[PDB]
Design an enzyme around this catalytic site. Structure first.
Site, short mmCIF file in Angstrom:
data_model
loop_
_atom_site.label_atom_id
_atom_site.label_comp_id
_atom_site.label_asym_id
_atom_site.label_seq_id
_atom_site.Cartn_x
_atom_site.Cartn_y
_atom_site.Cartn_z
N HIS A 41 0.85 -1.23 0.00
CA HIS A 41 0.00 0.00 0.00
C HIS A 41 0.87 1.26 0.00
CE1 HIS A 41 -0.33 -0.34 4.69
NE2 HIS A 41 0.02 0.96 4.53
N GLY A 143 1.44 5.93 9.89
CA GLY A 143 2.87 5.78 9.58
C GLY A 143 3.50 4.59 10.28
N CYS A 145 2.81 1.60 9.69
CA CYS A 145 2.67 0.48 8.74
C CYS A 145 4.08 -0.02 8.42
CB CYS A 145 1.86 0.90 7.51
SG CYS A 145 0.24 1.61 7.87
C1 LIG Z 1 0.57 3.06 7.23
C2 LIG Z 1 -0.62 3.51 6.86
C3 LIG Z 1 -1.70 3.74 7.87
O1 LIG Z 1 -1.47 4.37 8.89
N1 LIG Z 1 -2.90 3.12 7.66
C4 LIG Z 1 -3.54 2.86 6.42
C5 LIG Z 1 -3.69 1.60 5.82
C6 LIG Z 1 -4.39 1.79 4.69
C7 LIG Z 1 -4.91 0.85 3.60
C8 LIG Z 1 -4.08 -0.41 3.79
C9 LIG Z 1 -4.65 1.59 2.29
C10 LIG Z 1 -6.38 0.71 4.00
O2 LIG Z 1 -4.72 3.10 4.63
N2 LIG Z 1 -4.16 3.77 5.74
C11 LIG Z 1 -3.58 2.41 8.77
C12 LIG Z 1 -5.13 2.27 8.54
O3 LIG Z 1 -5.57 1.14 8.30
N3 LIG Z 1 -5.98 3.33 8.60
C13 LIG Z 1 -7.41 3.15 8.47
C14 LIG Z 1 -7.93 2.67 7.26
C15 LIG Z 1 -9.29 2.41 7.12
C16 LIG Z 1 -10.15 2.61 8.20
O4 LIG Z 1 -11.52 2.39 8.15
C17 LIG Z 1 -12.15 1.97 6.94
C18 LIG Z 1 -9.62 3.05 9.42
C19 LIG Z 1 -8.26 3.32 9.58
C20 LIG Z 1 -7.77 3.83 10.92
C21 LIG Z 1 -3.23 2.73 10.23
C22 LIG Z 1 -2.52 1.79 10.97
C23 LIG Z 1 -2.29 2.00 12.31
C24 LIG Z 1 -2.73 3.18 12.87
N4 LIG Z 1 -3.39 4.13 12.18
C25 LIG Z 1 -3.66 3.88 10.88
#
Ligand SMILES: *CCC(=O)N(c1cc(C(C)(C)C)on1)[C@H](C(=O)Nc1ccc(OC)cc1C)c1cccnc1
Length: 304
Positions: A41, A143, A145
């Site tokens: 991602h 961040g 990830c």
């Molecule tokens: C490293 C990226 C990030 O912080 N983050 C993330 C992952 C993604 C995907 C894999 C493209 C979905 O987008 N951003 C995560 C995260 O999963 N954020 C997120 C996505 C979707 C929802 O609800 C639908 C909620 C959230 C919080 C991430 C990981 C750890 C902490 N904060 C965010």
């Protein structure tokens, strides 16, 4: 004496964390030999994340669109491939701090240490368990990830977890190091349910053994129970059913405390039906399922 939620020493892993940048997205990667591993991602932009075509997205990118920094050392990316949900970036320099390591897919109920990272820099280390529904109750911000989960066996680092995402419920999902999700999750911004969490019965028993070892013996009773009768109760309370293998794994703690597994089970059954009544066990007012029989032995025998 004492009992703490101990994490493994993070030294060996600290020296493998790098930052990985692709356009404007930056996250953590793991540098082992001359390959960098990270969540695929990283190639997504804001728009792509609801419904990403990872094939089509990765086709627009060349080796030089990827920036890998380890401290002020910038690594040259000379090869790139996608293995399931990870990118493998071939870099020109083999990590001089590559430990002895293996990649392992772990089972639910197993514990590991997480080294939480932002921009390739370690911030903290904690121990947790792969819940039966293949989530973890982590502590992760934007961040984080690419932060990894690991076990140490003497000199050998076993990598079992890469962090990919947070579910709308606040818990955490990710992959093994071959990029296969734990559980039914996908790396897209859509709402996904983990199913029923359960308590890891074999882990609760292991901690009851830790408690007895460290002087907390009040919850020990006269009664006993069958496995079938214990299990009929466990299921009522969303506990994992206990098999002969579980009984086999607890034998050493059974032997050390002189308390049969089925007698410890009888004690657990009574706590389920009566609660703690305000009392604690190793300073907790709840039953703890994030120590394995191995963790308890290791902690109470001073393994290095
Ligand atoms: C490293 C990226 C990030 O912080 N983050 C993330 C992952 C993604 C995907 C894999 C493209 C979905 O987008 N951003 C995560 C995260 O999963 N954020 C997120 C996505 C979707 C929802 O609800 C639908 C909620 C959230 C919080 C991430 C990981 C750890 C902490 N904060 C965010």
């Amino acid at each position: 004496s004492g009992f703490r939620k101990m994490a493994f020493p993070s030294g060996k892993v600290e020296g493998c964390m790098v930052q990985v940048t692709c356009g404007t997205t930056t996250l953590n990667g793991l540098w082992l030999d001359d390959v960098v591993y990270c969540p695929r991602h990283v190639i997504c932009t804001s728009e792509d994340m609801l419904n990403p075509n990872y094939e089509d997205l990765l086709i627009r990118k060349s080796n030089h669109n990827f920036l890998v920094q380890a401290g002020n050392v910038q690594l040259r990316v000379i090869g790139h491939s996608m293995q399931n949900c990870v990118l493998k970036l071939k870099v020109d320099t083999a990590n001089p701090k590559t430990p002895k390591y293996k990649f392992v897919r772990i089972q639910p109920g197993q514990t590991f240490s997480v080294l939480a990272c932002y921009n390739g820099s370690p911030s903290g280390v904690y121990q947790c368990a792969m819940r039966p529904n293949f989530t973890i109750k982590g502590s992760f911000l934007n961040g984080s990830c690419g932060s990894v989960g690991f076990n140490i066996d003497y000199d050998c680092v076993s990598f079992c977890y890469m962090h990919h995402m947070e579910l709308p419920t606040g818990v955490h999902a990710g992959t093994d190091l071959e990029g296969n999700f734990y559980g039914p999750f996908v790396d897209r911004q859509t709402a996904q349910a983990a199913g029923t969490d359960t308590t890891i019965t074999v882990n609760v028993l292991a901690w009851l053994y830790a408690a007895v070892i460290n002087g907390d013996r009040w919850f020990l009773n006269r009664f006993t129970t069958t496995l079938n009768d214990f299990n009929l109760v466990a299921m009522k309370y969303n506990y994992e059913p206990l098999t002969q293998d579980h009984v086999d794994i607890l034998g050493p703690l059974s032997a050390q405390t002189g308390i049969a597994v089925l007698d410890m089970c009888a004690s657990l059954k009574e706590l389920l039906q009566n609660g703690m009544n305000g009392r604690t066990i190793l300073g907790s007012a709840l039953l703890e399922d994030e120590f394995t029989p191995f963790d308890v032995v290791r902690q109470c025998s001073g393994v290095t």
